[PDB]
Design a protein around this ligand. Structure first.
Ligand SMILES: [Zn+2]
Ligand SMILES: [Zn+2]
Ligand SMILES: [Zn+2]
Ligand SMILES: [Zn+2]
Length: 84
């Protein structure tokens, strides 16, 4: 699967998940031109590639996206929290 829940309002999302897929699953409104995946989305939004083990976040609307797992410079897994 491209994502899994871990707790109320909190999920792990594979970097390869399409932004459009994420919006369909989660009822969100993310958009970014010339970028198709959630890995590309978060990397672009952060503006810098995190070190392995470094877990910066980007907030947008009621969502917080965290770089949960890097494999070299590839963003493998995002953590997503939803707020009210
Ligand atoms: Zn949490
Ligand atoms: Zn740093
Ligand atoms: Zn390192
Ligand atoms: Zn390494």
């Amino acid at each position: 699967n491209l994502y899994t829940q871990v707790a109320d309002n909190e999920y792990l999302v594979q970097g390869r998940m399409l932004i459009d897929e994420f919006n369909e699953v989660f009822e969100t409104d993310l958009h970014m031109s010339d970028v198709d995946t959630m890995a590309g989305y978060l990397i672009t939004a952060l503006g810098t590639i995190p070190d392995e083990g470094e877990k910066p976040s980007f907030e947008v609307g009621n969502i917080k996206l965290t770089a949960e797992e890097m494999e070299g410079t590839r963003l493998l897994v995002l953590r997503v929290h939803f707020y009210d």
